[PDB]
Design a protein around this nucleic acid. Structure first.
Ligand code: MG
Ligand code: MG
Ligand code: MG
Ligand code: MG
Ligand code: MG
Ligand code: MG
Ligand code: MG
Ligand code: MG
Ligand code: MG
Ligand code: MG
Ligand code: MG
Ligand code: MG
Ligand code: MG
Ligand code: MG
Ligand code: MG
Ligand code: MG
Ligand code: MG
Ligand code: MG
Ligand code: MG
Ligand code: MG
Ligand code: MG
Lengths: 117, 153, 70, 154
RNA sequence: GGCCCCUUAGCUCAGUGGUUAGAGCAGGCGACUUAUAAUCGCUUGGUCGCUGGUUCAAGUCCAGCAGGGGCCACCA
RNA sequence: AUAUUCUAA
RNA sequence: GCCCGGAUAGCUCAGUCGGUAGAGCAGGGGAUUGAAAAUCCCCGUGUCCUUGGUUCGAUUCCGAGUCCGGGCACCA
RNA sequence: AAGGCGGCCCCCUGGACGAAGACUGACGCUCAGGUGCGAAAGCGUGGGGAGCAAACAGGAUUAGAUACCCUGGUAGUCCACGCCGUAAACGAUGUCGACUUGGAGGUUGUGCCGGCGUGGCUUCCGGAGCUAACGCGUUAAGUCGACCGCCUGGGGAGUACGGCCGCAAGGUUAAAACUCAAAUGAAUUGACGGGGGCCCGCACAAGCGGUGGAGCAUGUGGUUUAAUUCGAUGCAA
């Protein structure tokens, strides 16, 4: 509805799933797409391709706003964190800056116990 | 095999149209080393396809092949622990082999009376994009689109 | 890591330079370490093991320049 | 791997227990088994018990002339009725010596009925116990140990 | 007595809209596996619980029924 | 992802 | 003694309320294995507790018994 | 000292080390009993509780799955005070002192002129010697002295009984019968591993045609029979 022009692309990359959320500079969400909601469950959901297809659907959900330039924010260490940016760029946007905001504790809360698989 | 010494066997071009591609087709159609029987069945079926097209027998075959030829197939290969079904681009030689083999398999499970007719029918249904041949190309294309996510490079 | 894209700079380059900036900061390795609790005993055992391999690689560098194979 | 850990079969005819009575005891077998990897000879045994058919088991009638029946006042609550009424039954079976007392009901007839039933059950359970013990002991002796040392036949 | 909601494919389910269709588990064949599993591809199949009318083409739009439940009503 | 067992010369 | 429920495959259980019975585990035959399990494929299995009725026809609806389980056998 | 100790700042406080001197004058070493300290879990009282997580619950997996995996989650983990007194509390190596070739580091002092010495602590290799061997090797498991602790086949048993300690859990001290002809350490050759590396064979894969269903032939098992003669029985009947 309301033109915004310059916005942010948050990329929550987990080992399981990828969540692209395109916001404005003030951090109000416009549109979002997930690898899990893009016709990909299980193995296929945790792949750079499904995180590519997700990025596309998110670009194809905020054209009504007419975003021309994006600041990208990648989070977490999954396959999503690389190819999602390639997709946004190849979807037509102009990448102003790329920042990693992955939350690192300065030795904080005890992680969960190691999986014996 | 384990070595990798396969000198592509020397294949004669067929007598009538002079085409190694069609000579191959005959070989794939042939049963019990009865090539004479096979060649007759192919020429008959290409003669029939010549009439119901208005084109050269080789050109009418090419058009048929093209709508059968797959571009990417599924091959099961291990990456870590799990055994995923992965799309692989098919080599141009294996593009024709599959095609020719698919057509003959397709044209061996119809109701029509003579194989020559069954072949002509399927080679025609191929040209249009209808036959069981050009139904299993789709299948081997779309199953190679579901697993598109596993195409790691 | 925070990469600003400069004027007249292609994307593919600015992405490789972002990848490098994160690998240099060791972000992905940091988060993989924080995934599960390693008991202190296990943390000391692998610190010891690493140093023993680093040190044994030095002694496995002499027997190569000094000794001949063919 | 086949065969039987135990196989109990009734063999019915004329003159069976006259010809199989001697099969009772240990049977020692010496061969290369089917369950043997190294082709080693092994020495196994099986116990065979041949016990003759005992005339089924006729649960006999409770002859009233073999009973002593005592009636007396029941114990506990029930006001004047329980004070004055011979409700309670003690049936003593003279043969076995089994005695059953019953004063669960307020009527002597119900008590006597219930007691005959129980005395029946207890007499018929006691004789079926003897038969099991007799059979158990008879079998025990025929079998011997399953050990290779205790055998009639090799 | 009122309102209503929903009662469509084996088992189920889901619903716009001028129609009997979309699945997801099942059931068939394919691929896959060391073999089971999972995975994937292909197909398979409703008197839209029924029944009228009314509609350029109405299960719906609107009646007469059946069906169950949920809350409210009920002083021969 | 799933793979238990093998008496006694 | 009376009362309520139940009796269906070898075992544990569905089911049906007048016609034409299922499940799981056992069982059999095959496969897999050096072999036994586990697993996979193919099969079979019932006088529907016993009688005497009603009925064209009863597992099903009566009325008896029999066996099993669950009540109760009271106020005093 | 061991247990242990990790942001930064202050306060209180212990030890170590080096340099030059000065001082005391054998005041030392070791230590049964004794005393103290002593991870984690645990216990008591009162706080606290983000994250994690015994128990517990559900979901999976499976033949089953009181597990591993998943979603939750209470004690507990944190604080104060008290208790417990144990750990593969390990260097599986008691403390103290002396002596006996080397090399390469790390760390922390210090003397002299980027070099050359001299101390402390410490990591790795290795010589003699030692050792059953593996290994240890001036930080000895070498060569010696002082003192203490401790062992005497494997099971039974670090258990019972008794004592002492403890709120308890338990700790500590510590047998016997009976039973076996071993139990054990290191190393060696293999074999094996759901260890690693590298190779090969129609071993898989890629293909083509079969078998398993039908009828018949034929061999076998079984069953039958007076007899169905004997042998071959995973691959390799
Ligand atoms: Mg987790
Ligand atoms: Mg067992
Ligand atoms: Mg002491
Ligand atoms: Mg603690
Ligand atoms: Mg407490
Ligand atoms: Mg507290
Ligand atoms: Mg858990
Ligand atoms: Mg101890
Ligand atoms: Mg320690
Ligand atoms: Mg240590
Ligand atoms: Mg010790
Ligand atoms: Mg001392
Ligand atoms: Mg050394
Ligand atoms: Mg003790
Ligand atoms: Mg004691
Ligand atoms: Mg093959
Ligand atoms: Mg056959
Ligand atoms: Mg023979
Ligand atoms: Mg023989
Ligand atoms: Mg012979
Ligand atoms: Mg022989």
């Amino acid at each position: 509805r309301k033109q915004v022009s310059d916005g942010v692309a948050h990329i929550h990359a987990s080992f399981n799933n990828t969540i692209v959320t395109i916001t404005d500079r003030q951090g109000n969400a416009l549109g979002w797409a997930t690898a899990g909601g893009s016709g990909f469950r299980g193995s296929r959901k945790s792949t750079p391709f499904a995180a590519q297809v997700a990025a596309e659907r998110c670009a194809d959900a905020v054209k009504e706003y007419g975003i021309k330039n994006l600041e990208v924010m990648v989070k977490g260490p999954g396959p999503g964190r690389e190819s999602t940016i390639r997709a946004l760029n190849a979807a037509g946007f102009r990448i102003t800056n790329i920042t990693d905001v992955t939350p690192i504790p300065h030795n904080g809360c005890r992680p969960p116990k190691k999986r014996r698989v | 095999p384990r070595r990798r010494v396969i000198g592509q066997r020397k294949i004669l071009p067929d007598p009538k149209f002079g085409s190694e591609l069609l000579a191959k087709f005959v070989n794939i159609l042939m049963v019990d080393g009865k090539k004479s029987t096979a060649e007759s069945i192919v020429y008959s079926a290409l003669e029939t396809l010549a009439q119901r097209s208005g084109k050269s027998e080789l050109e009418a075959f090419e058009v048929a092949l093209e709508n059968v030829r797959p571009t990417v197939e599924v091959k099961s290969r291990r990456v870590g622990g799990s055994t995923y079904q992965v799309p692989v681009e098919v080599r141009p030689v294996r593009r024709n082999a599959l095609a020719m083999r698919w057509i003959v398999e397709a044209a061996r499970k119809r109701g029509d009376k003579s194989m020559a007719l069954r072949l002509a029918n399927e080679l025609s249904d191929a040209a249009e994009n209808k036959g069981t041949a050009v139904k299993k190309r789709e299948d081997v294309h779309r199953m190679a689109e579901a697993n598109k996510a596993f195409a790691h490079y | 890591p925070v990469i600003k894209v400069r004027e007249n700079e292609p994307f593919d380059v600015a992405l490789r330079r972002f990848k490098r900036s994160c690998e240099k900061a060791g972000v992905l390795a940091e988060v993989r370490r924080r995934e599960f609790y390693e008991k202190p005993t296990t943390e000391r055992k692998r610190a010891k093991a690493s140093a023993v391999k680093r040190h044994a690689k030095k002694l496995a560098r002499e027997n190569a320049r000094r000794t001949r194979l063919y | 791997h086949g065969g039987y850990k135990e196989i109990i079969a009734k063999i019915s005819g004329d003159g069976v227990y006259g010809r199989l009575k001697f099969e009772s005891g240990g049977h020692r077998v010496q061969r290369v088994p089917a369950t043997e990897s190294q082709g080693r000879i092994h020495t196994s045994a099986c116990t065979v018990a041949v016990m003759p058919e005992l005339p089924d088991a006729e649960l006999p009638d409770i002859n009233p002339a073999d009973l002593r029946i005592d009636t007396f006042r029941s114990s506990g609550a029930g006001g004047q009725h329980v004070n004055t009424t011979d409700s309670a039954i003690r049936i003593t079976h003279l043969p076995t010596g089994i005695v059953v007392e019953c004063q669960d009901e307020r009527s002597q007839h119900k008590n006597k009925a219930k007691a005959l039933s129980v005395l029946g059950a207890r007499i018929h359970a006691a004789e079926m116990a003897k038969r099991q013990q007799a059979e158990a002991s008879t079998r025990r002796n025929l079998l011997g140990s399953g050990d290779r040392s205790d055998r009639n036949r090799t």
